[PDB]
Amino acid sequence: AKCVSYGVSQIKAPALHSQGYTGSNVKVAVIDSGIDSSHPDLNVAGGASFVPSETNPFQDNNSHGTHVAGTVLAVAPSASLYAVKVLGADGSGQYSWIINGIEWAIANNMDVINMSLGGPSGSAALKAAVDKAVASGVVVVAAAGNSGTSGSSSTVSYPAKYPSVIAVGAVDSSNQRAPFSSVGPELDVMAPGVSICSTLPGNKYGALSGTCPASAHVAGAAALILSKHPNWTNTQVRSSLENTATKLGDSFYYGKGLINVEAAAQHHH
Numbered sequence: 001a002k003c004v005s006y007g008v009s010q011i012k013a014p015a016l017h018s019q020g021y022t023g024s025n026v027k028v029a030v031i032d033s034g035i036d037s038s039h040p041d042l043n044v045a046g047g048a049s050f051v052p053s054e055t056n057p058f059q060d061n062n063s064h065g066t067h068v069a070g071t072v073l074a075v076a077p078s079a080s081l082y083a084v085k086v087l088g089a090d091g092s093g094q095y096s097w098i099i100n101g102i103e104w105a106i107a108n109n110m111d112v113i114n115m116s117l118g119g120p121s122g123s124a125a126l127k128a129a130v131d132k133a134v135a136s137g138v139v140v141v142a143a144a145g146n147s148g149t150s151g152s153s154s155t156v157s158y159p160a161k162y163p164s165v166i167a168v169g170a171v172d173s174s175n176q177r178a179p180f181s182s183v184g185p186e187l188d189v190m191a192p193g194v195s196i197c198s199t200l201p202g203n204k205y206g207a208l209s210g211t212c213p214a215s216a217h218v219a220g221a222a223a224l225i226l227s228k229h230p231n232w233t234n235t236q237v238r239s240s241l242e243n244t245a246t247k248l249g250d251s252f253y254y255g256k257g258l259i260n261v262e263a264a265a266q267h268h269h
Helices: 006-010 013-019 064-075 095-107 124-135 211-228 234-243
Strands: 027-032 044-049 080-085 112-115 139-143 166-171 189-192 196-200 204-208
Touching (some): 006 013, 006 189, 006 211, 013 211, 027 095, 027 211, 064 204, 095 112, 095 124, 112 211, 139 234, 189 211, 196 211, 211 234
Parallel strands (some): 027 112
């Protein structure tokens, strides 16, 4: 919205905006550090905190959840955001809190979950939660991780590494993989994640880099697609994103390539 970012153009979201599609009547759970609901550039429809030391989901003492929220709305200006707080101010949280946030999102009929987070190990309970959300029809998106490379090893974080999740890596403004962007066969798509200007807490704006902003673009893209195709299943939304991506190089580094929401939203299955 108020801070200009190249990322919205890069994924061809303006083509949907010109068609009149802005993610109307789509519920997106921002599973992160909260959202500063006081920010003039944001609107928050609901939410919940599972961080025992940080009980307000509508404040953000980390900044990432608020930044992610702004990127989702830059891509899908009409999306309904829900602040699902599972990370503290230091950007860490327990998997049980994260799972409680996913469970809340399922119970409250979210259309899209964005998880701008991950750890190097997952759990069976974490996999069961994302698999259940996907079985329930939710589009589940996660940041692939900022762990760079490890030779031929996967560095994709959990829960992005699980097959049911859309694992999002980060490119720069010229579609080059960002040096921090995690890699491996579990990587699904890329999106803009270098120096992305978005909302920060306390009526502020600023650039951040990471797979966190990249995931936000794909969560916004899912909302644009559902506004044009509200009947599409999560299966069909996911297919539309992966099958119409712009190929960028070896799938170990780039997955299917850069999301193209214009192409995805006119995909014929």
